[PDB]
């Protein structure tokens, strides 16, 4: 509910650069084309958290998000991938 | 197709759908230029093929939650009518 | 000069749907991804005019542009393809 | 790289260039998410490789007209410094 609104906001607004600009994710109405479609990947929380934290390939590692924000966007993505809002 | 049903189908394809079909798909009639999904002017699906994709989802396309059945029938008819013109 | 401003405006604003939404063309700062990069294709005036007039593949045929507007966007594209503004 | 030269390189990559490099290219440092051209965080070009592309154009990438040589050197240094971080 509220932990979802948070991840959504990180995915769309707080992240730098924003996840939504690089990634596709229907729940967020995000259609970024730079990296993989997250509705296709359907990653678990750990996989997201690791990717955001360390970076991977040409994806940059996080600098501005706190650890709890990284967890919240990891939880969010892993829960909503493949599905639309509510 | 009567002008009011076409107007209905356009509104669903462009705005009512969640996410909006036009966010992901191209369809010249609606001036939709989505890229993530297939170009519907290329696909030229029939009404049943559209109805099934929207109702059930397909691959990374999400299943509909917001539209009613009548609204799904409406957009299916719309897309199958105008795709490729 | 003025015949170029015209083609540019047709390419960006007057066309329905707009050429710029489907096509990439540097002079217009257009980065549409639906059809081919026109800076890559570098078509002659005839090839553009025919495509706009008749449509081709999933590209729709024109309905709203007058014949002189079709000529102007054909002239424009064929002159500027591969190059940036002035 | 001093903060003012980085600020210069960002401004050129994002706004001064014509068209804007960020319109076509991805570069995380600039929050650029262009798709038409290659991802520069993947390419990780050196300064000479950037200078040559911008000066001469390459494939469907147009040659620079607007930037001065100093401005081309600046953006080349910028991209080669930050590409991949
Ligand atoms: C471009 C400037 C991006 C930013 C902003 C975000 N992501 Fe990303 N991501 C991007 C690329 C090019 C890749 C592919 C990496 C590779 O070379 O394989 C990714 C990858 C991911 C993944 C999958 C990682 C894996 O284990 O395979 C995930 C789950 C992911 N990215 C999520 C994600 C999040 C939550 C972002 C906001 C903090 C984010 N990405 C931003 C490109 C870019
Ligand atoms: C991104 C979040 C999408 C939205 C929103 C809509 N569609 Fe979609 N669609 C999308 C993808 C990635 C695909 C490919 C599916 C696959 O893996 O093959 C599709 C596909 C379709 C199709 C073709 C289905 C088939 O039988 O092959 C149709 C007819 C279609 N989509 C229609 C459609 C409608 C009506 C939408 C709004 C209700 C809509 N799509 C939204 C991506 C996305
Ligand atoms: C999508 C909704 C588009 C609109 C709007 C415009 N174009 Fe297009 N164009 C599009 C596609 C998908 C294609 C490929 C056709 C194929 O199947 O091969 C094209 C093609 C062209 C071409 C090349 C034609 C050829 O001879 O190979 C040109 C020169 C071209 N289009 C120009 C053009 C102009 C001027 C437009 C505005 C009036 C325009 N296109 C709009 C997709 C779409
Ligand atoms: C679209 C109109 C572009 C703009 C604006 C810029 N670039 Fe670009 N770039 C573009 C394409 C399609 C390509 C691929 C070229 C090819 O055919 O291989 C490129 C390539 C580059 C490269 C790599 C060059 C190489 O040696 O392979 C670099 C380093 C590069 N571009 C940098 C760059 C800069 C600094 C820009 C602003 C001055 C810029 N590009 C704009 C497309 C477009």
Residue numbers in the entry:
A (entry chain A), C (entry chain A): 29 to 114
B (entry chain C), D (entry chain C): 27 to 111
Paper quotes:
In most cells, the detoxification of sulfite by oxidation to sulfate (Equation 1) is catalyzed by sulfite oxidizing enzymes (SOEs). Here, we have investigated an electron transfer complex involving the periplasmic SorT sulfite dehydrogenase from the α-Proteobacterium Sinorhizobium meliloti, which represents a structurally uncharacterized type of SOE, and its electron acceptor, the c-type cytochrome SorU. In S. meliloti the SorT sulfite dehydrogenase is part of a sulfite detoxification system that is induced in response to the degradation of sulfur containing substrates such as the organosulfonate taurine. Electrons derived from sulfite oxidation are passed on to the SorU cytochrome, and likely then to cytochrome oxidase, as S. meliloti is capable of sulfite respiration.
